[PDB]
Design a protein around this ligand. Structure first.
Ligand SMILES: [Mg+2]
Ligand SMILES: [Mg+2]
Ligand SMILES: [Zn+2]
Ligand SMILES: [Zn+2]
Ligand SMILES: [Zn+2]
Ligand SMILES: [Zn+2]
Lengths: 162, 162
DNA sequence: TTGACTCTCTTAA
DNA sequence: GAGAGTCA
DNA sequence: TTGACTCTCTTAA
DNA sequence: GAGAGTCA
């Protein structure tokens, strides 16, 4: 809604409902050959999802609340950050999953940062493998690794230098 | 269609033209506090770009050659890799700039890999900062660093546990 | 055969 | 990663 | 009011 | 990060 008290009330009912999502334990790589344990509060795969929740995409959901007879709606992972600036350096703030588990709505697994910072975590070495993120990663990104490059830098002639 | 010999001729004419693009010397971070030097062969900001080159987008260009009366066209950074597999692990191969300079067409600054591998380089610590890419980075990714997270994981109540 | 424009599409966040 | 509309 | 669906859009590779 | 069309 508009007031601070109204925003807090939305965050509180959101936390309460998400707090009832089935909790799944996920064992994850932390980097440095170590492994950790995360507890994700996962939104159901099909309706009903929970009071105020509806799916707008294969892995997109929205939280809806009627305040003064007028309905307000937000991306499902954005609610915890309603009181924070919605941009940083002219870039939109986005819900970033430290657990890299889209269905998870655990606010302890979420941060609010630019889409670039958000995507970048996919390749982070992890909390025990060299992560330098100021708001630290909970695990090594799923895409961290040597890659699978088909062909590297090369030239046929002698017109170029590195 | 085009024989291997014909493709080689296209790569050679491409190298010849790009070789004449302004060569710009850039001082870049390599990771681990070290600075390096990269020499980029940059396509002009406006027409004419060079023989065979035309702009199809703000920072997208194509290379075109007519052989035996049939017109052939390729993404401008894809020519060096015309004789390589065009997919890997079921993913389309894409032109990845080891120099992170879009206008650059120096083949010694390009590699051929999946879009995920491609993007991930934006956050790499660099060849002197811990890069683990099998086809090593030439520099530290422009987006590597602490990031600028606005708000971290948090909860108002006690419904959650990490 | 070529140059200089036009257009829409792909991926995963 | 987001926005909003259509029905019941 | 609340739920369960539908659509298209943004970003930067 | 891409493929393809128009026009002279
Ligand atoms: Mg994410
Ligand atoms: Mg790139
Ligand atoms: Zn989680
Ligand atoms: Zn990290
Ligand atoms: Zn370059
Ligand atoms: Zn690297």
């Amino acid at each position: 809604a508009l007031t601070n008290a109204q925003i807090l009330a939305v965050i509180d009912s959101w936390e309460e409902t998400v707090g009832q999502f089935p909790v799944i334990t996920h064992h994850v790589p932390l980097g440095g050959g170590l492994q950790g344990t995360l507890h994700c509060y996962e939104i159901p795969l099909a309706a009903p999802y929970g009071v105020g929740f509806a799916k707008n995409g294969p892995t997109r959901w929205q939280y809806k609340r009627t305040i003064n007879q007028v309905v307000h709606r937000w991306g499902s992972h954005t609610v915890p950050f309603l009181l924070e600036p919605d941009n940083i350096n002219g870039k939109t703030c986005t819900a970033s999953h430290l657990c890299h588990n889209t269905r998870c709505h655990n606010p302890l697994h979420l941060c609010w940062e630019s889409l670039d910072d958000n995507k970048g975590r996919n390749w982070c070495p992890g909390p025990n493998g060299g992560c330098v993120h100021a708001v630290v990663c909970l695990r090594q990104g799923p895409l961290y690794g040597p890659g699978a490059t088909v062909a590297g830098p090369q030239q046929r002639g002698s017109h170029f230098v590195v």
